[PDB]
Amino acid sequence: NSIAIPTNFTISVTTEILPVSMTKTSVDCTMYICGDSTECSNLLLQYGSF
């Protein structure tokens, strides 16, 4: 025989973090890689599918 029961208690309301979203950066290809450069975008469009 033995047990353990709390005579009283506490309401230990604490923190909790669940990171929801991020920066949904829609990083393009023809400008991020190729800023004001027809040459870079020309070379990258044959990569394409990437």
Ligand X SMILES: *[C@@H]1O[C@H](CO[C@@H]2O[C@@H](C)[C@@H](O)[C@@H](O)[C@@H]2O)[C@@H](O[C@@H]2O[C@H](CO)[C@@H](O[C@@H]3O[C@H](CO)[C@@H](O)[C@H](O)[C@@H]3O)[C@H](O)[C@H]2NC(C)=O)[C@H](O)[C@H]1NC(C)=O
DSSP letter assigned to residue 32: T
Site for ligand X in 5-24 (CB under 6 A): 7-8, 10
Question: In this complex, which beta carbon is closest to ligand X, that of residue 13 or of residue 17?
Answer: 13
Question: In this complex, which beta carbon is closest to other proteins, that of residue 19 or of residue 35?
Answer: 35
- Which of 44, 6, 7 shows the shortest CA–CA distance to 28? 44
Residue 35: CB minimum distance to other proteins, A: 8
Largest CA distance in the chain: 84
Binding-site ranges for ligand X (CB under 6 A):
7-8, 10
